A paper describes a structure:
Here we report the mechanism of three Fe(II)/α-ketoglutarate-dependent dioxygenases in bicyclomycin synthesis, which depicts the natural tactic to sequentially hydroxylate specific C−H bonds of similar substrates (cyclodipeptides). Three αKGDs (BcmE/BcmC/BcmG) catalyze site- and stereo-selective hydroxylation of inert C−H bonds in BCM’s (bicyclomycin) cyclic dipeptide scaffold, one of the simplest peptide derivatives without additional functional groups. Our hypothesis posits distinct regulatory mechanisms: BcmE employs steric hindrance, BcmC relies on inherent reactivity, while BcmG utilizes a directing group to control C–H hydroxylation. Although these three enzymes share only 35–42% amino acid identities, the overall structures are similar, and r.m.s.d. values are 0.70 Å ([name] vs SsBcmC), 1.07 Å ([name] vs PaBcmG) and 0.87 Å (SsBcmC vs PaBcmG), respectively.
The carbonyl group of the amide part of the DKP ring is stabilized by a π-π stacking interactions with the aromatic ring F273. Additionally, Y308 forms hydrogen bonds with the NH group of the DKP ring and the hydroxyl group of Y120. Two water molecules mediate the hydrogen interactions between carbonyl groups of DKP and residues R111 and D275. The 5-methyl group of the DKP ring is oriented towards the iron center, suggesting that hydrogen abstraction is likely to occur preferentially at the C-5a position. This observation is consistent with the activity of SsBcmET307A. The presence of a rotatable single bond between C-4 and C-5 brings the possibility of C-7 closer to the iron center, thereby preserving the reactivity observed in the wild-type [name]. We found the steric hindrance of T307 could bring C-7 closer to the iron center. As expected, the dominant active conformations for hydroxylation in the F273A, T307L and [name] systems are C-6, C-2’ and C-5a (shown in the dotted rectangle: 49/5000, 90/5000 and 14/5000), respectively, which is consistent with our mutagenesis results and structures, particularly the crystal structure of SsBcmET307A•FeII•αKG•1.
Numbering used by the authors: 6 to 312
Write the structure that this text describes.
């Protein structure tokens, strides 16, 4: 396959406590959307963020995470009965049509997921879908800002991003509940499959694996964490400034009785799943692989799933 990239040895995932002091945090560049575009605080911040593959972006004022935070804390629970909050529960029993969508009980990971692409956001409380709309819209603006910063000619963008820069593509809100009762890794070490991931988290536990070094990626109040995905990496790997999709994963979280579990949620921006994966070679975006086969490949690596 033309999109494999070179092998990455994945170490066992450390426990939360031992990781907390052993692996110091990456220093992330800060940025915000202002004047209608992504702007970094520091003059070389954009270049450093593309090289780092992680950075921070201010939560835009029109995006209030509150409803998403509440949904993330409850979606995995059984309905209580006679309880208004049940509107935010029971989603392990909610079917969502489409590949890679719906509820997932990951056998070998702490997390269980509820994944909903934008065309299916009516299955969510409207106020929760509204958070996904703000995060995904931010993610598209960031993607536009990246491709402009790379000076990639705009005539290519809609094709090579499978519609994302035209606000189409596969835009997926993803809720994670880390089941602290499971004595395994929080997640597998993985690359995200797509272009730009916007991550809402408040707790430590995310690690970056970079050329055999483990470093923490710590959230910052009032900001999202942003990283890049394998589709952007493959697109740019032969260019003079390649963009890195970092390998990352969540520690085996540790919670005593009564301590709330870790949660997080993201918007993944993937190419349209009927499209093609491209790589710039000799100025031209070369078609390498269908997005369908690429997705199956990348999802197959990101989880240890016998089905
Ligand atoms: C690849 C693994 C990571 C955690 C995440 N999981 C998914 O299922 C989607 C699949 C995409 C093709 C819609 N993308 C992602 O980045
Ligand atoms: O929970 C986190 O900090 C990261 C989650 C993540 O990597 C993912 O959802 O793909
Ligand atoms: Fe991820």
């Amino acid at each position: 396959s033309a999109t494999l990239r070179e092998p990455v040895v994945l170490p066992p995932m450390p426990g939360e406590h031992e990781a907390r002091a052993a692996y110091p945090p990456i220093g992330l560049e800060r940025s915000r959307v202002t004047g209608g575009r992504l702007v970094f605080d520091r003059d070389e911040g954009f270049d450093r963020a593309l090289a780092q593959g992680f950075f921070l972006v201010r939560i835009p004022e029109g995006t209030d995470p509150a409803a998403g935070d509440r949904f993330a804390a409850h979606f995995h629970e059984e309905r209580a009965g006679g309880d208004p909050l049940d509107a935010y529960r029971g989603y392990r029993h909610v079917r969502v049509p489409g590949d890679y969508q719906g509820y997932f009980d990951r056998e070998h990971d702490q997390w269980e997921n509820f994944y909903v692409e934008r065309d299916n956001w009516d299955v969510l409380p409207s106020e929760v879908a509204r958070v996904g709309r703000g995060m995904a819209g931010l993610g598209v603006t960031i993607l536009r800002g990246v491709l402009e910063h790379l000076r990639l000619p705009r005539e290519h963008w809609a094709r090579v991003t499978g519609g994302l820069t035209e606000d189409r593509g596969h835009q997926m809100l993803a809720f994670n509940h880390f089941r602290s009762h499971k004595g395994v890794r929080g997640s597998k070490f993985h690359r995200d499959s797509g272009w730009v991931t916007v991550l809402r988290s408040v707790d430590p536990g995310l690690l970056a694996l970079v050329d055999g070094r483990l470093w923490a990626v710590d959230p910052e109040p009032g900001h999202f964490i942003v990283n890049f995905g394998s589709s952007l990496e493959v697109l740019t790997e032969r260019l003079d400034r390649p963009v890195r999709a970092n390998v990352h994963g969540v520690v085996s979280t540790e919670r005593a009785p009564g301590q709330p579990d870790r949660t997080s949620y993201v918007t993944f921006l993937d190419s349209d799943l009927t499209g093609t994966v491209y790589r710039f070679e000799n100025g031209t975006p070369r078609p390498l692989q269908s997005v369908a086969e690429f997705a199956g490949q990348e999802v197959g690596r990101a989880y240890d799933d016998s089905g």
